[PDB]
Design a protein around this ligand. Structure first.
Ligand code: HEC
Ligand code: HEC
Ligand code: HEC
Ligand code: HEC
Ligand code: HEC
Ligand code: HEC
Ligand code: HEC
Ligand code: HEC
Ligand code: HEC
Ligand code: HEC
Ligand SMILES: [Ca+2]
Ligand SMILES: [Ca+2]
Ligand SMILES: [Ca+2]
Ligand SMILES: [Ca+2]
Ligand SMILES: [Ca+2]
Length: 627
């Protein structure tokens, strides 16, 4: 017995007896009543002191009225709370909006049915009718873009409204700690200008992900009538969470301000909203000014691929590349072979910077039709490794020089790409070609896609922008299939051009794409992801292992490559053999057909000999499932 989702509604609030009597209705994912909840609670009862009541320009705030774990299970899905000690500070005011924060802890019903955590708030007027005014600024869904939904965020609770209901202005005042008011704390813990906590944690990682982008949490919504408060209510308490060097009382770094009465007179909402979003808006506008459309063909006699790139404008209209060439900062073409199991490796891939800082490489030209044309020079080895190897696949990344939201000429031929404020990575593309002339093979893209990456990195993620690459922006330009609803899938299959079964530049980095995203995020994003495979995966494509060969998993002492059979390679990125994270010894893994950090020849010969999926039946919901 398992409940997938526990829904909670406050269906009745009655003050006929003084202390409100509060009824909660609980249903499962099929809208059936849930009877026997043992850990239901009113975590907080609050009422809303309105905007400006504590002083001109001051925020609305939640005043505390108590809590209750005293309830009767009415045996029909409803539960009725009473308060043994309502409003112990005697501040109740029926003219104020009243809020109740209700939580149900994860656990089991008596019959043993598992029940997940549930949290909610609901607002009322002082007689239990609908409220007359609210403080609805954000909703819990924004946090779930980056923090695993249903798991605690730092501590105490899983939904932001529960945090807000405890981390109130009253709470902070009572502790003498302004910074623990939630509207200060929330920005503090994602911004690196000052540390937080007794251990003085500098939020370097949070800063690098959030980048002070107000729109990842402050989102327009008809559901949230105070959503524009992030620009409409400037206060020293909130604005100082990132602006940590101003002393408004002493007038250092800013004119003296003794209260919040005049902030809005100067910091008008238009300005605050615009200035904090200007650069991401400008960059997004530049990215969407141009596109590219790429084709590739194989010469059947020379077996080389010729890649042709058509620049287009925002409407899809052709743009002769000669007209914008002086502003093209880089354009790179990387070609590998065998999209389901790349065959050329990292050293054997074809790659060129066809353009650098306005200059065409001698190996690339612009034809009379205005297209860039380049022909591969490395041995593509087409058709030498089975049918999949009939297909070459080419990844095109490019960037354009830019300053303050405008494209500009690349005036410096030697510009090294380190200063990312001087250029914009643009929409990348992917082109297939076959030696036979038959339709190309393509890699599966049905298990991970860019929408998941964009939840944390935004859709404008300029992947690898810097000294080494132009920056790959991933979009429907390189989509070649749709999901069951007809939405174009933006895959990461182009990344395999470099993230090959042989690894990347070193054999020691688990560079194969099947390994690399796991390695980076289990090492550096575990606080956000943990074992939550759904953070990237809609499914696992276990059938894809039948198209895989050996995967590079280590470097030998002499720096040559060591390889594993592909399921073992994929699981061991997070489950290192010989570590506390892997119960199977090397010997046992070999008894299941695996090769573990052996030669490419041995791992290749044994690549379809692994018996792991006889026992293991992983799903995204539970990847640990075994028979
Ligand atoms: C992606 C753009 C995020 C959004 C949206 C939210 N959070 Fe966040 N948060 C993010 C990162 C990358 C980090 C650093 C993690 C690390 O391991 O260093 C954080 C950190 C926090 C913290 C600090 C404590 C911690 O768990 O590390 C808190 C308290 C926190 N985040 C809360 C939080 C809330 C309530 C959000 C919705 C309003 C929210 N975050 C959104 C990334 C992102
Ligand atoms: C009361 C029922 C709480 C709930 C709900 C939430 N938090 Fe909390 N938090 C609470 C206390 C008593 C404290 C210690 C405050 C102090 O005096 O130092 C905290 C502290 C934090 C912090 C540390 C802030 C800092 O040191 O600057 C963070 C980052 C934090 N809490 C986050 C947080 C989140 C994200 C919550 C909702 C998921 C949340 N808290 C709820 C009490 C309560
Ligand atoms: C998620 C990690 C956030 C980011 C990024 C930014 N804000 Fe935020 N803000 C967030 C929360 C959860 C809250 C509390 C809402 C509540 O109901 O209490 C806030 C609050 C503010 C406020 C206070 C508004 C008020 O009525 O007093 C302001 C002025 C504000 N936030 C501004 C702001 C700006 C300018 C940001 C980008 C630079 C920004 N926030 C980012 C969550 C997050
Ligand atoms: C962290 C999430 C922030 C919060 C909260 C607030 N601001 Fe901010 N501010 C932040 C950044 C990253 C920047 C630089 C933006 C850029 O692209 O250059 C700013 C900048 C300003 C400025 C202009 C700079 C100056 O020297 O004056 C102003 C006037 C400003 N911010 C005001 C402001 C107000 C009024 C805030 C509370 C509503 C506020 N900031 C919060 C980051 C963050
Ligand atoms: C008019 C007399 C103002 C009053 C009243 C308030 N602010 Fe201000 N502020 C004002 C200016 C002209 C600037 C510089 C703008 C620029 O782009 O250079 C600022 C700056 C700030 C900042 C940013 C600080 C920084 O990043 O260096 C913040 C966060 C800020 N101001 C907040 C703020 C608050 C909270 C106010 C009321 C207490 C307030 N300002 C009043 C002009 C004026
Ligand atoms: C939130 C749960 C994330 C998901 C979903 C994705 N990524 Fe991620 N990524 C995340 C964090 C916290 C970090 C560490 C950042 C730091 O400052 O240490 C990363 C790191 C990367 C990087 C490194 C480059 C960088 O800009 O930091 C890359 C190239 C990267 N992530 C790619 C990526 C891909 C392709 C994703 C979809 C499969 C993806 N990320 C999802 C957080 C999260
Ligand atoms: C060759 C031109 C590459 C392309 C195309 C892609 N990546 Fe890459 N990546 C490349 C190298 C040489 C390295 C360093 C060595 C290593 O294997 O770690 C990387 C690294 C990463 C990482 C690790 C974190 C980091 O260094 O940024 C990640 C998460 C990563 N690469 C992801 C990634 C994605 C999602 C790609 C397609 C959009 C992609 N890379 C393409 C070289 C090349
Ligand atoms: C984003 C940071 C990821 C998280 C979190 C997890 N996985 Fe993943 N996985 C990711 C990528 C980019 C790929 C490569 C896709 C490709 O084209 O090669 C994979 C691949 C797998 C596979 C192979 C089968 C497939 O669907 O392609 C497996 C079996 C797999 N991943 C398992 C897995 C598990 C069990 C995770 C939770 C512990 C998990 N992944 C998280 C990206 C990310
Ligand atoms: C990182 C992206 C992982 C990948 C790839 C795989 N697993 Fe995993 N696994 C991961 C975590 C973070 C955890 C939880 C560890 C904890 O104690 O919290 C697990 C756990 C398991 C388990 C259960 C633990 C045990 O001792 O058996 C199993 C059975 C398991 N994982 C299997 C498994 C398989 C078969 C994988 C390849 C298909 C695989 N995991 C990949 C993280 C990651
Ligand atoms: C049945 C005889 C199995 C075979 C065949 C394979 N595995 Fe297994 N595995 C099995 C069990 C009973 C467990 C423990 C489950 C638990 O919840 O305790 C595991 C565990 C793993 C793990 C997690 C290890 C850990 O977290 O310490 C991994 C990563 C794993 N197994 C991988 C794996 C591989 C790669 C296999 C084929 C070579 C394989 N298993 C086969 C049972 C069985
Ligand atoms: Ca209701
Ligand atoms: Ca909820
Ligand atoms: Ca901080
Ligand atoms: Ca295309
Ligand atoms: Ca077999």
């Amino acid at each position: 017995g398992s409940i997938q989702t526990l829904n909670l509604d406050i269906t009745k609030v009655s003050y006929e007896n003084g202390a409100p009597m509060v009824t909660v209705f609980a249903t499962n994912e099929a809208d059936m009543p849930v009877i026997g909840l043992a850990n239901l609670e009113i975590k907080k009862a609050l009422q809303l002191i309105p905007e400006g009541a504590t002083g001109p320009g001051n925020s609305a705030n939640w005043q505390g009225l108590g809590s209750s774990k005293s309830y009767v299970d009415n045996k029909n899905g409803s539960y009725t709370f009473k308060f043994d000690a309502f409003d112990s500070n005697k501040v109740f005011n029926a003219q104020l909006t009243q809020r109740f924060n209700v939580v149900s802890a994860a656990g089991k019903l008596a019959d043993g049915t598992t029940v997940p955590v549930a949290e909610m708030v609901e607002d009322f007027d002082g007689q239990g009718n609908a409220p007359q005014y609210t403080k609805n600024i954000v909703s819990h869904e924004v946090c779930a873009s980056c923090h695993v939904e249903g798991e605690k965020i730092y501590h105490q609770a899983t939904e932001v409204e529960t945090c807000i209901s405890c981390h109130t202005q009253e709470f902070a005042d009572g502790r003498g700690k302004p910074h623990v008011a939630f509207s200060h704390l929330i920005h503090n813990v994602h911004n690196a200008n000052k540390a937080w906590g007794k251990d003085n944690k500098i939020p370097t990682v949070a800063q690098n992900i959030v980048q002070d982008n107000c729109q990842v949490c402050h989102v327009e919504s008809d559901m949230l009538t105070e959503a524009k408060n992030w620009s409409r209510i400037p206060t020293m308490e909130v604005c100082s969470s990132c602006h940590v060097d101003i002393d408004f009382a002493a007038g250092k770094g800013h004119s003296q301000q003794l209260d919040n009465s005049n902030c809005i007179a100067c910091h008008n909402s238009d300005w605050t909203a615009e200035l904090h979003t200007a650069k991401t808006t400008a960059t997004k506008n530049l990215i969407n000014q141009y596109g590219i459309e790429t084709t590739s063909t194989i010469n059947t006699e020379t077996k080389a691929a010729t890649i042709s790139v058509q620049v287009v404008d925002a409407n899809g209209t052709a743009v002769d590349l000669k007209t914008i060439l002086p502003k093209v900062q880089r354009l790179e073409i990387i070609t590998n072979v065998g999209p389901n199991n790349a065959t050329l490796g990292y050293s054997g891939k074809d790659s060129i910077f066809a353009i650098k800082n306005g200059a065409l490489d001698p190996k690339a030209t612009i034809n009379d039709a205005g297209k860039l044309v380049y022909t591969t020079t490395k041995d593509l080895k087409l058709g030498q490794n089975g049918k999949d190897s009939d297909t070459a696949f080419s990844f095109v990344g490019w960037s354009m020089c830019s300053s303050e939201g405008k494209f500009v000429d690349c005036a410096d031929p030697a510009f090294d790409g380190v200063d990312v404020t001087k250029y914009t990575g643009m929409k990348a593309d992917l082109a297939f070609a076959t030696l036979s002339g038959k339709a190309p093979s393509t890699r599966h893209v049905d298990s991970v896609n860019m929408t998941a990456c964009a939840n944390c990195h935004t859709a404008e993620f300029e992947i690898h922008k810097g000294k080494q690459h132009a920056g790959f922006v991933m979009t429907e330009q390189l989509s070649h299939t749709q999901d069951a609803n007809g939405k174009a899938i933006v895959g990461l299959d182009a990344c395999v051009t470099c993230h090959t079964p042989d690894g990347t530049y070193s054999f020691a980095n688990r560079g194969a794409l099947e390994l690399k995203l796991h390695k980076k995020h289990v090492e550096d994003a575990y606080g956000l992801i943990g074992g939550n495979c759904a953070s990237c995966h809609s499914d696992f494509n276990l059938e894809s292992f039948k198209k895989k060969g050996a995967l590079n998993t280590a470097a030998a002492a002499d720096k040559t490559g060591l390889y594993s059979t592909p399921i073992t390679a994929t699981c061991t990125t997070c489950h290192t053999v010989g570590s506390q994270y892997m119960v199977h010894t090397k010997e046992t893994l070999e008894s299941f057909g695996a090769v573990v950090d052996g030669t490419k020849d041995d791992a290749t010969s044994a690549a379809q000999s692994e018996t792991c999926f006889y026992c293991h039946t992983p799903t995204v919901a539970d990847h640990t499932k075994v028979k």
